[PDB]
DNA sequence: CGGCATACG
DNA sequence: GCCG
């Protein structure tokens, strides 16, 4: 088992769920705490887990895999050995736990102004919503569209969304062209948003481009929020529900053909596996890789990458499809 | 021990 | 919290 999630294949459902569920409870309160050393080790040991070809059933079976410690392999044993771990039931149902979560779950709200509103006393979105002058537009918008946007988007709405996205994008720029990126592309059947790459094949065409998407949007009606030159956009769009719609959570981002493979292998994530192929680049290659392209600082060049499989070829790395970046 | 991903809004 |  290798040490980096990038150098294996991690698949969108797997053999040790609820093993893996519990870390990521110890991960994400280790971020509430600000440690993200301890988020990133407890989630990298439950991405181990998920890459595994089998169920753990004995505490043996973790000797010699990367990230398991005297911690993490202590929380196992004990769900192994009765079916729950003390610690993380105590997490879960600990105030500052379900705050936290319910406060940073957001959209406009991280964990810095969950964490100033937990010290100042503040526990429900109607205490948020009682103090209203604390809130910048942006929250305002999340916790108004927060029941909504706490609905999970299903794959069934993305097909309509992207229908209505490209027919902006083809009157803001005739040949643009609309991806799906982010958890869908790696097989997710739900999600908390739906993520677009939109480029043009003819280099420099795009510059300019969103902002003539966005005022197209919201001229059709379809926007209930966004933030207005700029390339990203983190917007709430209606969509149509039987007789009625809701509020969904959409990004678009637009990259130059150039940069393409390289913003669709960052937007497609995941999260954890972007993060883990930036830090093998830099840190076993010596190349820095971000959205735009991947950098030699000693020769001071950037690769010129046609696919995201001349990225993973670049980096020494098998390739591994969308469905299998589920780190 | 140092390190832990990244740039745009 | 764990790796090198
Ligand atoms: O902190 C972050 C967040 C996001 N991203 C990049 O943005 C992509 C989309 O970020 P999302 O937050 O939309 O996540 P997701 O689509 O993977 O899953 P859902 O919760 O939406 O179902 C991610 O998959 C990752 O590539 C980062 O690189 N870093
Ligand atoms: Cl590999
Ligand atoms: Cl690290
Ligand atoms: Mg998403
Ligand atoms: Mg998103
Ligand atoms: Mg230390
Ligand atoms: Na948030």
Known sequence: ???????????????????????????????????????????????????????????????????????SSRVVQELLEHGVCEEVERVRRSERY???????????????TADRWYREGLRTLDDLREQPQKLTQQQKAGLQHHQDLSTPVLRSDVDALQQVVEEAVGQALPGATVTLTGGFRRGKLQGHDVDFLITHPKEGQEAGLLPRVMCRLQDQGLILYHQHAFERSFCIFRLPQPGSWKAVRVDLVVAPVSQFPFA?????????????????????????????????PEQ??????????????????????????NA
């Open 300 to 325: 001071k060049t950037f690769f010129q990458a046609a696919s995201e499989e001349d990225i993973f070829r670049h980096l020494g790395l098998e390739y591994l499809p969308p469905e299998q970046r």
């Open 1 to 71: 088992m290798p040490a980096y999630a990038c150098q294996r294949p991690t698949p969108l459902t797997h053999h040790n769920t609820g093993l893996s569920e519990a870390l990521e409870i110890l991960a994400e309160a280790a971020g509430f705490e600000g440690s993200e050393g301890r988020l990133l080790t407890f989630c990298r040991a439950a991405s181990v887990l998920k890459a595994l070809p089998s169920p753990v059933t004995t505490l043996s079976q973790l000797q010699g895999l990367p990230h398991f410690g005297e911690h």
């Open 264 to 296: 669709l292998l960052s937007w497609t994530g995941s999260k954890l596996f972007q993060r883990e192929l930036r830090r093998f680049s830099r840190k076993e290659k010596g190349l820095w890789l971000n959205s735009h392209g991947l950098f030699d």
């Open 98 to 112: 379900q705050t936290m979560k319910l406060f940073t779950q957001i959209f406009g709200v991280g964990v810095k």
